[PDB]
Design a protein around this ligand. Structure first.
Ligand SMILES: CCOc1nc(NC)nc(NC(=O)NS(=O)(=O)c2ccccc2C(=O)OC)n1
Ligand SMILES: CCOc1nc(NC)nc(NC(=O)NS(=O)(=O)c2ccccc2C(=O)OC)n1
Lengths: 349, 349
């Protein structure tokens, strides 16, 4: 269960750019306190960790955390059980886990001055946003309200502190620069599979349209849908009749068509309502967001694709949250991912 | 050289507190955009990773990154060679690596509003500080000026971008709360050895005085010296006759004397001048900082301690930077750490 044999492991930085302050650096002058004068800063680089089994079988997997998270979520569950990193090294895949730019060991671009500001340039906004425990509780469908759990819960109850401690803010790095870093990683790795989550769902779809080395996508509970430009289908408002889901991302149809060349699976957990739910905003948000994703997958399929929606309850798994890969049944979730990889030969050399 | 057999691996969050916003949370109202209303935020928690070998021998090692760094620096060198994590799991030690609060996967305490501000409470400062590539080049003694290498340098040339990309800012989390998180980890772990670096040198000394489970300290190029309260010796200014080293940390003698109860080694690399060097501020800074540490160790030994200063050149290792554990000879550096552990029985069950 817990044992793991690695041919090699390591980590590295990839992607990013540099920005500079004014003037010249004088090594005779006091270097502390730190100044922007004569300064070169590396910004928006990404952290990558890799673990390779002895004699891997099939393509490397790239696990890409959701919004406000880090590669921790693939390492261990909140109660300390093995994460997908261990499970899939054991399943003989090389496993990459990333901390995207702006998260965890990824770069947070700030300097000497107000957060995110390099002299007169605003690299990222000084004003931040961040979810609360309460917001995240309902966003991840632990239960309909903070403190409550759905009946069928696979959440590791008792480990709420561990769970919410893994979450944090993201600075306003452009999504283009996040996608760019992962495109560079995919170039470095070669043919691979992207395994995405929540906020990284739409970013992974974008990466695949720029990087033919992406041979497959599995997206756990993706947060933003994607459509060809000008072809977003009618999507209803939420039951409060005022709110909307996240504005779907629109890409040129020439790029969207690249999504029809690779197997794509979206995975949803449990307790997404079938009918409008005006008393529970994020439950209703998930209902309409999942609907929008079903239309996105249909558009990919109308273009020759191999896109599918897996609702874990239809596969016999009840009670999953929006983090199925750290829930109590995450070994059974992993088995369904192994099934997808096997079906498309992504577990074969 | 690279194969590793883990009995188990994983990661978890530990330490920290909570802060709360005003008001209450209504699950029926839009959760996004995120708001401080009814919000609970987990802040200042620390990320911990562990890798355990089969049949461990001796005490677990806790590797604690220097200032503006993360546990990455123990995983791999900038040119991709094994870091101390791999080397010491191979040396049959369980190995913990942390991202301290405010760094990497540790929490960065910010909310909805100007960086670090929770309504009118400033949790961390909105104005940040951060080294440049140029300041870090001379701080780490790659050479005397940015872009120039000492002839004898053990730095992995050609991987400068990779190296500097690992560095970043730290918010103004109080050092007390950083020490608190590690004390809690040490309580959770049991008897262990701290391996510290640069800015975590003084913090690790402080942890030892609060945590009898710390059975030894090895500090690579510690940045701040520590003395009993009111017994700071005379320390000269820098060669410019205007700058000072970091103000020594002072602790109550009853706490200081706990440092005499365990083996302590400070490790310094090469190219620290013996004589005043007015032209190169950080070289001179290291000359006086090393001298202050020599007096700190002497004060520990006058309390019955066993505190030593290891200059790597005297061991036949030339050219090390302020990150000896990621330099080209880091295997030989690791051998000297294994020697220390073995001399003191810390590699024995
Ligand atoms: C502050 C403006 O909010 C905002 N607007 C847009 N559309 C313009 N997109 C984003 N990005 C996200 O995906 N949000 S989220 O918080 O990471 C998220 C939401 C829902 C479900 C899951 C997540 C997630 O990844 O949690 C694991 N955020
Ligand atoms: C505004 C600064 O005044 C101030 N005083 C104190 N005294 C406790 N400590 C700090 N912290 C730092 O600046 N650490 S440092 O930059 O990362 C660093 C400096 C020198 C040598 C090494 C490091 C380091 O850790 O290299 C990885 N700063």
């Amino acid at each position: 269960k817990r044992k793991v044999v690695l041919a090699e492991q390591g980590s590295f930085y990839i992607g990013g750019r540099t920005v500079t302050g004014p003037g010249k650096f004088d090594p005779s002058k006091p270097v502390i306190r730190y100044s922007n004068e004569g300064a070169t800063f590396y910004i928006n680089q990404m952290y990558v960790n890799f673990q390779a089994p002895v004699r891997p079988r099939g393509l490397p997997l790239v696990f890409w955390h959701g919004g406000g998270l880090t590669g921790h979520i693939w390492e261990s569950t909140p109660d300390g059980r093995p994460g997908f990193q261990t499970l899939f090294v054991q399943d003989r895949h090389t496993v990459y886990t990333i901390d995207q730019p702006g998260r965890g060991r990824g770069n947070i671009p700030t300097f000497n001055g107000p957060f995110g500001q390099l002299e007169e340039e605003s690299i990222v906004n000084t004003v931040t946003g961040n979810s609360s425990k309460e917001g995240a509780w309902v966003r991840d469908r632990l239960g309909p309200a903070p403190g409550q759990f759905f009946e069928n819960s696979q959440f590791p109850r008792g480990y709420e502190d561990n769970y919410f401690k893994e979450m944090g803010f993201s600075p306003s790095i452009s999504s283009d620069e996040i996608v760019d870093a992962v495109v560079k990683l995919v170039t470095h790795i070669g043919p691979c599979v992207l395994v995405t989550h929540a906020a990284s769902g739409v970013l992974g779809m974008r990466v695949a349209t720029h990087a033919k080395n992406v041979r497959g996508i599995v997206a756990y509970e993706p947060a933003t849908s994607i459509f060809p430009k000008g072809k977003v289908p009618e999507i209803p408002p939420l039951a409060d009749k005022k709110s909307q889901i996240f504005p779907p991302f629109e890409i040129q149809e020439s790029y969207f068509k690249k999504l029809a060349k690779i197997p794509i699976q979206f995975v949803f957990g449990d307790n997404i309502p079938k009918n409008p739910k005006s008393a529970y905003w994020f439950l209703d948000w998930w209902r309409v967001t999942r609907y929008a994703h079903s239309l996105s997958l249909e558009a990919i399929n109308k273009l020759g694709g191999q896109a599918s929606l897996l609702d874990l309850p239809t596969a016999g798994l009840r009670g999953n949250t929006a983090f199925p890969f750290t829930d109590r049944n995450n070994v059974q979730v992993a088995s369904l991912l192994s099934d997808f990889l096997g079906k498309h030969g992504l577990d074969q050399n």
